[PDB]
Design a protein around this ligand. Structure first.
Ligand SMILES: *C(=O)c1ncc(Br)cc1OCc1ccc(C)c([N+](=O)[O-])c1
Ligand SMILES: *C(=O)c1ncc(Br)cc1OCc1ccc(C)c([N+](=O)[O-])c1
Lengths: 303, 297
């Protein structure tokens, strides 16, 4: 019993963290096979971050300006290229600890674990959602750049690399091909993350988790259009039939129809929680996918 | 920027998890050097009232199947220490980290690697004042362990029972009044970890949330209110442990107690602090500094 924000076991990713140094700039890199991946702004000086011309900046750089550390052993860089916003440093040594892995670009509302890292060494692990506005709400300090986000299915699916801490304390970065999530660019100018919304299908998954664990008081019908008319008023993501189908297997195991749970949530939005808690939270939680809930509640393991 | 309930990196512990079977029962064990550690109720059948030394007498070494991955370990000795079984095996675990066994104190925090059938499921981050923990354990998780890291793993917890959750240190000594038998058992009234909530408010101020800043008070004055609200009383040791946070934020500990007293007596008014609509007590002062200063391992 119980329900917690659970992160994936992080061992397979710990063995892939390295420390990447270019000039005086030092951040984290990801060492898979004979390639190291890090944010391309590792080549930026103090003044260069304000308006970098990365192509011109990287032309001023040869292989020997890139110093890669893995624990103690230096790696020889024998090739460098830029792919979108990530630098790729080919090294002469395949990582012996390379897990089976894939590169993945997730969708708003999906979750993953971040291994927060400084100087190439793991500091901590926690779970995150890709917000609808393509930011993430995490714990990133200067130096955390290059930490990665991942899911595990024995195969590690890397989905996020950390690139930047914005004003308002929001966080942004790229997939592992270097394509930013959201409108952001790797330039130190003020950058607007637009209006966020609440991940509706996730809140519903979490109410199911609440029922599975004996937390039932909010159980109490409505329609998809009626619910969408309420949800839009409270800045909730609209609920599509696809989302109802993703909640199917929770509906089965819990014996509560998707539409009935929407009725319960509609009531919760219009009246708040009156000081009650759900799963020990005083707010409605939207960073659990339906997959997350079934995973935790059916004890899925990895190796 | 930002603040998250953050677990330790779990790699060194992952390498130590094995599956332990005795009869029909299978749960998790911890494999360090040539010794496997697991809850002694692995030997219990369908436990309403077990006599452990009598039940363990009917067991020989070959009655315990220990599997690390696809590899079967050979069991060459077995002994009971308090409520954990210690299975001696013929092979030292190659992946043994530098480690210690420690008994944490109520209010201290740690990470749990939830495990089933010897394989890692997930990691999350307090030992309640009433010696329970509020976790996520399904049937089969028993044997999963709690730990802090310093390159040294401080093993502090082993999971034994879903009542809420309860278990032992790594010498098999239960935290709290519990015993490993399937009778209904009462934990004490649970109370809020006052020094931790304060640490958390310091972290709030560090990240820009200051709306609750307000007045001052006295340790006895505050303690009188903490008592009313089921808070653990604040001692000078607590105040001293919050010292370094007081320096960074420039808010005196006793000034922070006054705001907390206001929050206790006024509620939160529908506002939030670090994204939570409740007061949060599962961050130690150590945790706040580790996260806010990026300590690594
Ligand atoms: C990011 O965490 C980071 N780590 C280490 C270094 Br040396 C530099 C880092 O980023 C600095 C930074 C600051 C602001 C902005 C907007 C960016 N960026 O252009 O993305 C980078
Ligand atoms: C605990 O999680 C567990 N895992 C696997 C098995 Br085969 C058995 C397990 O514990 C069952 C159990 C149930 C209730 C009680 C009170 C105890 N206990 O005596 O501690 C154990």
């Amino acid at each position: 019993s119980g329900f917690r924000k659970m992160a994936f076991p992080s061992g397979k990713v710990e063995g892939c963290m390295v420390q990447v140094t270019c000039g005086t700039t030092t951040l984290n890199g990801l060492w898979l096979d004979d390639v190291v991946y890090c944010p391309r702004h590792v080549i930026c000086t103090s003044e260069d971050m304000l308006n970098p011309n990365y192509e011109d900046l990287l032309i001023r750089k040869s292989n020997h300006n890139f110093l890669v550390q893995a624990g103690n052993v230096q790696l020889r860089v024998i090739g460098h290229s830029m792919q979108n916003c990530v630098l790729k440093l080919k090294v002469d040594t395949a990582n012996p600890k390379t897990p089976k892995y894939k590169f993945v670009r997730i969708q708003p509302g999906q979750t993953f674990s971040v291994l927060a890292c400084y100087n190439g060494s793991p500091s901590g692990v926690y779970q995150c959602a890709m917000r609808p506005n393509f930011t993430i709400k995490g714990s990133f300090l200067n130096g955390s750049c290059g930490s990665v986000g991942f899911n595990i299915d024995d195969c590690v699916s890397f989905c996020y690399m950390h690139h930047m801490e914005l004003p308002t304390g929001v966080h942004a970065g790229t997939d592992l091909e270097g394509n930013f999530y959201g409108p952001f660019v790797d330039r130190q100018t003020a950058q607007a993350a637009g209006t966020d919304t609440t991940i509706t299908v996730n809140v519903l998954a979490w109410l199911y988790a609440a029922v599975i664990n004996g937390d039932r008081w909010f159980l109490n019908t409505t329609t998809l259009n009626d619910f969408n008319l309420v949800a839009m008023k409270y800045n909730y993501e609209p609920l599509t039939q696809d989302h109802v189908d993703i909640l199917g297997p929770l509906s089965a195991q819990t014996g509560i129809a998707v539409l009935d749970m929407c009725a319960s949530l509609k009531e919760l939005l219009q009246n708040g929680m009156n000081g009650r808690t759900i799963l020990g939270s005083a707010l409605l939680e939207d960073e659990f996918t339906p997959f997350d809930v079934v995973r935790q509640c059916s004890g899925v393991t990895f190796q």
